[PDB]
Amino acid sequence: VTQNDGTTTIANNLTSTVQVFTDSEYQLPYVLGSAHQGCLPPFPADVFMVPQYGYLTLNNGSQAVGRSSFYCLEYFPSQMLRTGNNFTFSYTFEDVPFHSSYA
Amino acid sequence: DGVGNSSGNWHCDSTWMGDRVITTSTRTWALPTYNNHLYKQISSQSGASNDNHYFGYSTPWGYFDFNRFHCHFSPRDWQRLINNNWGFRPKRLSFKLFNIQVKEVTQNDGTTTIANNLTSTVQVFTDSEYQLPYVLGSAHQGCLPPFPADVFMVPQYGYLTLNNGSQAVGRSSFYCLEYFPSQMLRTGNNFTFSYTFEDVPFHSSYAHSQSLDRLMNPLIDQYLYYLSRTNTPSGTTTMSRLQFSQAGASDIRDQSRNWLPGPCYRQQRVSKTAADNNNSDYSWTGATKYHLNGRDSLVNPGPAMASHKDDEEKYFPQSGVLIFGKQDSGKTNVDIEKVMITDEEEIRTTNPVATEQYGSVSTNLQSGNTQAATSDVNTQGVLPGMVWQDRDVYLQGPIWAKIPHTDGHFHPSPLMGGFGLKHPPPQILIKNTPVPANPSTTFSAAKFASFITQYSTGQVSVEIEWELQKENSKRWNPEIQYTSNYNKSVNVDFTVDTNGVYSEPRPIGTRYLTRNL
Amino acid sequence: HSQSLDRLMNPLIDQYLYYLSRTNTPSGTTTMSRLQFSQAGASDIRDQSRNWLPGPCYRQQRVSKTAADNNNSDYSWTGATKYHLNGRDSLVNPGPAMASHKDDEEKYFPQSGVLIFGKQDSGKTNVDIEKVMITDEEEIRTTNPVATEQYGSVSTNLQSGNTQAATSDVNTQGVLPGMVWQDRDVYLQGPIWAKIPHTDGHFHPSP
Amino acid sequence: DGVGNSSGNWHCDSTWMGDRVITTSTRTWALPTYNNHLYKQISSQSGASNDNHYFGYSTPWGYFDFNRFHCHFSPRDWQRLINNNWGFRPKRLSFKLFNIQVKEVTQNDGTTTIANNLTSTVQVFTDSEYQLPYVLGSAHQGCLPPFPADVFMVPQYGYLTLNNGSQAVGRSSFYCLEYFPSQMLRTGNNFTFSYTFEDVPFHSSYA
């Protein structure tokens, strides 16, 4: 996006890249456990914004205890994708008891 | 292959296989155009001091330097290597440049707009024959940033040659880089090269548990006598008849010792407490210096010598310690609380204190009428039977340096720190190919003075394979380790602040584990 | 060499290592002493941290080819450099490889420390200067000390509020770790080889 | 092949194998449009001197001339060849054009902006049958620059024929270059040709 005293114009950038990684070793704070917004919308016609990623650690008051560990995500291997690349991964669930829908 | 298909994947990882650790790091760089695509000689302005004259050329090219450690090791990966291992040396590295994109900037009375230029090229070459001035040996800025989220500018490449005053001696040779074979890269090409290190002794991360002065069993006394009392009282006339005594635990200072301390160059001593140091301008006139070809040159690193003796943490050698700045430290006349002064007390066992003299030496021959006289020896070169420890690498300090090609050299390990190599990792130079702009219709022989204004950017991937020396010891009691303190503080150490500025709190030396001497 | 030890780095970018720039700072004209640091760059190169040092040197006396300048005294021996073992003073003719002179002096040369050859039909004793051919070793001037000038200065005493910092020139410097040097040149007339004496130990066997 | 893949690598090197030396040189050129894409005859203005009348055509085409030495030899490579050798002659050459990019300039009351034109082409041909006026024989400007960092403009191509005064004699023949077969090159094509020299006596560098 280019802004010049208003009238900003969007022009596709072919060369730029988008980098994606799935941890799969569970070495990151797991944010997904709690209910939050920004999931895929219910109704497929919608278009959704991808939510930001942050995390909390141990603390005393507002100050940080030496225990708190700060993770840098840039430090994992991640696949980089220009226009015309696709990133696909497959996951298999451990066996878990049925959910009981009966009353 | 193509504009749409991406050339390489981001690899930043550290894997600890067993003996060997493989450290990979990837960064994003941006390369401007230097000197408007033309060489220029540079020289000392007018005149300043006889010592500061220099002559050299400044090329449009620019180069990558990963020579610092913290490029490769995260502070945590540094902590593992440092605590669990005696020694480590590199084995082989591989370098990769990918996802290059060239951008052309247009300026029209402000509101400049950047629009990608697909056709333009970026040319890269690694010498590997060492036919260029090797710039990488000395500490400099512009290395890969410590923290992978950062984006760094690729530094310009220039070099210095022989000179008399500001003028150039016929000996000086000017190298044109355009004259090497170099690979040219459009968007969608990647340049990768692999280098293997010559075998080099391990870096010693251990500190000694004994000192040279105390290398013997205190329980049993030696079979070798020494002069104990030169004169013996008789009738109060103090007649001089020499006597001898065996050496033991009671009087250890006289025991015969097998080896001596490492060679030392004396330094001036300054203290961190501002009140104690003298009120005078001794920054230069009082400094230690060494001069060749009539130009005094300060000695910053000096030979590896302990910074201070015990029960003094205040004092440190004037010139002779590595000094690093904290976050956003100024570039000149900064106050003391801004810089981080490293401490080399770990070496205190085998090497002399930098401030105190090597020892005293007897000057004259005694006689009935003359008293025996001795004098301190400020400087001591190497003698047979001397042992010493090299200066520490730390985290920020350089990894290696190039031994100059010379007739002879003694103990090639560099003074700053790291691994002296005869064939260092070759320099990687990179430049934007110049693109002319709107040549006039009628012919003119004069060369183009005006080009498109453009720069290029893309990722760079450096991977080094380190070999380790596993720690095998029998010490009963626990060691010293590098531990981040558990007290609560505003900012965690080695982490970003609230504005996003990554800061390294203190210098981390590599010597914690203890081997007996 | 096309470079010198003192100038082995890129002038464009300044180093990340600080050094003491100004020991004391003016305040109320009382000159209170608080030390300050500065990074090193092209502007003040003489202070940049350098990786290696100059080759070991043995000091020589300096004589000049112009006959008027040299002192009117018999210093041919009493002023010469000497080294003695087993109580017999022995002149050092070759000396360690050290540059004969600094720049902008072609007049001076070390007293004992240069190879000297005779021209055709030169006498065998007390020959005049214009008869001998004095070799010049300025090529080495980069990595090795000048034979006449001292290796460097060294701080003698510890500073204090009441004592000024004092330093002293170091005339002789043995080898330290991290020193590099160049060997003396062969020339055309000089010898091809020599025999390393059989001994317990020897350092850098080049003659 | 494609817009993204680069056509050729920069080669500038000089290798001395033994008897033979192979000199390579690479430069960057820029080619404007001459005469707004149309032929024109040119002739001596009005009149000046009987000797200076000329008649000829000026084509839009432009040509490469590497005919000077210092294109190929760096001053140092020249010094080696010149000092150690009696004579030298060429054997075979190879010529390569790569990484062609066409740019279209737009002018709108100033602030002209250049934006790459991907579709446009550049057409090149080497005659090799010697059916054209040979311009290269005489010393002229516009050769490859001595120093590889430079960027040079490709010179225009024109030629002279027989004439009487400023007027043209029926004998004069006007060549249209468009009439040869020529390879056309978009971005991502490279044009290379190889030529072998007839045997010619050595140049004598001895005195």
Q: Do C45 and B52 touch (CB under 8 A)?
A: yes
Closest by alpha carbon to D144, among D91, D68, D207, D83? Answer: D68
- Nearest in space to B380 (alpha carbons), one of C170, A64, C51, A2: C170
CB contact under 8 Å between A14 and B118, yes or no, is: yes
* Backbone phi, psi, residue B358, to 5°: -65, -40
Nearest to B495 among A14, A70, A76 (CB): A70
Pick from B286, B272, B320: nearest CA to C33: B272
Q: Which residues, in sequence order, are bridge partners of residue B436?
A: B451
Contact: B181, D9; criterion CB under 8 Å: yes
Task: Work out the number of other CB atoms within 10 angstroms of the CB of residue D48.
Answer: 10
Does residue B6 contact residue A81 with C-beta atoms inside 8 Å? yes
Residue A25 distance to chain B (closest CA, Å)? 13
Closest Cα of chain B to C41: distance in Å? 9
Tell me the chain A residues in contact with residue B2 when contact means C-beta distances shorter than 8 Å: 84
Query: Which residues, 6 or more positions from B53, have their beta carbon under 8 angstroms from its beta carbon?
Result: B43, B44, B47, B163, B165, B166, B295
End-to-end CA distance of chain B: 58
Task: Confirm or reject contact between A37 and chain B (CB < 8 A).
Answer: no
- CA dihedral (B49, B52, B55, B61) positive or negative: negative
- Please tell me what DSSP assigns to residue B367: B
Residue B347 CA to residue B309 CA, distance in Å, equals: 10
CB within 8 Å: D8 and B184: yes
The residue to which tokens 């060849």 are assigned: D81
Cβ C179–B56 below 8 Å, yes or no? no
Q: Do D149 and B120 touch (CB under 8 A)?
A: no
User: What are the angstrom distances between the C-alpha of C92 and each of B442, C59, C97, C113, C182?
Assistant: 73, 11, 12, 7, 19
Positive or negative, the Cα torsion across B147, B152, B154, B160? negative
Among chain B residues, CA nearest to C141: B293
Strands D87-88 and D28-30, by their bridges, are unpaired
DSSP result, chain A: -B-SSS--B----SS--EEE----S--S---TTS--S-S--SSTT---PPPP------EETTEE-TT-----GGGS-BEEE-TT--------PPP-PPP----
Q: Across the interface, do C38 and B300 touch by the CB < 8 Å criterion?
A: no
Q: Are B255 and C113 a contacting pair, CB within 8 Å?
A: no
Q: Which residue has the tokens 């558990």?
A: B486
Instruction: List chains touching D (3+ CB pairs under 8 A).
Output: B
Q: Which residues of D touch B189 (CB under 8 A)?
A: 4-6
Euclidean distance between CA atoms A76 and B14, whole angstroms: 9
Chain D residues with beta carbon closer than 8 angstroms to that of B184: 6, 8-10, 99
Measured CA to CA, the distance from residue B514 to residue C8 in angstroms comes to 36
Q: How far apart are CA B374 and CA B364, in angstroms?
A: 7
- Is C29 in CB contact (< 8 Å) with chain B? no
Distances (CA, A) of C109 to B161, C70, C129, C143, C190: 25, 11, 13, 18, 19
What residues of B are in contact with residue D148 (Cβ under 8 Å)? 176, 178-179
Of B153, B195, B173, B177, the closest CA to residue B31 belongs to B153
CA distance readout (Å), B500 to A29, B149, B202, B495? 20, 10, 37, 9
CA distance D204 to D207: 8
Residues of B (43-72) whose Cβ lies below 8 Å from D = 60
Residue ranges of D 130-189 with Cβ closer than 8 A to chain B: 141-142, 145, 147-153, 155-156, 187
What is the CB neighbour count within 10 angstroms for residue B145? 17
Whether chain D has a CB inside 8 Å of the CB on B447: the answer is yes
For residues A99 and A58, what is the distance between their CA atoms, to the nearest angstrom? 34
Closest by alpha carbon to C23, among B124, B306, B134, B333?
B333
Could you give the CA distance from residue B400 to residue D24 in angstroms, rounded to a whole number? 35
DSSP state of B109: S
**Would the CB atoms of B487 and A66 count as touching at under 8 Å?**
yes
Backbone angles phi, psi at C139, to 5 degrees: -60, -30
CA distance B462 to chain D (A): 23
β-strand pairing of B151-153 with B20-31: parallel
User: Quick one: chain D helix, strand, coil %, rounded to 5?
Assistant: 10, 30, 60
φ/ψ of B179, rounded to 5, equals: -95, 5
Chain D residues closer than 8 Å to B41 by CB: none
Task: Note whether A16 contacts B: Cβ–Cβ < 8 A.
Answer: yes
Best mutation target among B332, B378, B413 (most C Cβ atoms within 10 Å) is: B332
Selected for mutation to probe chain B from A15, A59, A81 (highest B CB count within 10 Å) is: A15
Rounded to a whole number of angstroms, the distance from the CA of C42 to the nearest CA of chain B is 8
D residues 80..139 contacting B (CB < 8 A): 99, 101, 103, 105, 111-116, 118
- The answer to whether B65 and B155 are in contact (CB under 8 A) is yes
Of the residues A82, A83, A85, A86, the best mutation for testing chain B's interface (the one with the most B CB atoms within 10 Å of its CB) is A82
Count of alpha carbons within 13 angstroms of residue B183, beta-carbon side: 13
Contact residues, chain B, for D5 at CB < 8 Å = 1-2, 186, 188-189
Place of tokens 């770990």: B346
Q: Is B13 on the interface with A (CB under 8 A)?
A: yes
Place of tokens 């000695």: B299
CA B433/CA B307 separation, integer angstroms: 49
Where does residue B120 rank: exposed (0-12), middle (13-18), buried (19+ CB within 10 A)? buried
C-alpha C89/C-alpha C112 separation (Å) is 14
- CB of B42 less than 8 A from some CB of C: yes
Resolution in A: 3.3
Closest CA in chain B for residue A6: B111
Using CB atoms within 10 A of its CB, is residue B428 exposed (0-12), middle (13-18) or buried (19+)?
buried
